[PDB]
Amino acid sequence: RFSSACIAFIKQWQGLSLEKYRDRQGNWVIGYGHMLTPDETLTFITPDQAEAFLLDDLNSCDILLQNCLPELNDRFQRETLIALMFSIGHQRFLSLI
Amino acid sequence: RFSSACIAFIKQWQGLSLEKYRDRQGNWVIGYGHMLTPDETLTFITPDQAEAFLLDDLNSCDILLQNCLPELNDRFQRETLIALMFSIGHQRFL
Amino acid sequence: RFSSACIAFIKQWQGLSLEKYRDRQGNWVIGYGHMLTPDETLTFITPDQAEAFLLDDLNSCDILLQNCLPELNDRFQRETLIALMFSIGHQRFL
């Protein structure tokens, strides 16, 4: 349901991690910045599992946005708001090439 | 939950209707831009009820931020995101 | 200046008109939602001219961020702010 361009834009900037890591706040993260639930036992995932978690995270935020902005029907503005929150809400790491 | 200044900023611009009205995009709205649900059968409310609907609506935006920005610990940025979304997501009155 | 993915995201949604048209709020627009100035006398442009106007319009948003977020060194956040502002600030085509 998200545009392929919105998904490519987030993947232009969000790195992929196939192994889980602790972020600055000590929470476990994996894939494209996916925060794991408290009981999750996995350490590694596949690229397809990471893609599914990214779609899960984007669609969850879309459903909850709908409920904050009930009259907002412009899908462009929904996607840009979601990409904005994704960029503010996820810690990324510096890369010197 | 929200600062009095954040709430006042939203009321400076949103504007109150104690009677329901059909806004520019065809939805029934009341209070401070609150979109009516089919279980909300009142077409006239008190200012206290208008404020309570506003806090529900801001809480809906807070739920979004708690789930999609779970590590945001900057209350100013939280509040500015909520005000921005309220301004884009609700239509103006008059 | 802007990533190809950021540009593609804006083109996925904005939509191209090689002919000028009066948008929903009454302004003359052309290309990818580019608002005409009185010195822009063409009413028909090439796709290359449409892309050049888009890069001017994104540069106007970049000038805003360079002056009002001068310490922002997160290109992703820069680009998401630019796309959000483009989506709120330009009307859709069809």
Next chain:
Amino acid sequence: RFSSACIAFIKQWQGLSLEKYRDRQGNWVIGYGHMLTPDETLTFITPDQAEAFLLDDLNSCDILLQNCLPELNDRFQRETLIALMFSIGHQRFLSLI
């Protein structure tokens, strides 16, 4: 020209400094997060001077926003975008009471 409520909202959260300081990037800042120009010689300012710099910063961003969002006429959305940029664009400091 900005609403008193927009100005009070930014002052609810942005602290006032009457003396200049170096931010994380080594730039000089004073007042309500006002970045000083390269040649400025002042070290201290008054609260009225800080207020004028805040209005200067808000109105500069308004003029440049106008030029990025030429069709945006809703003053509420202009003010919220400006407050958002102000909160993202300025470093603030932790206060334990």
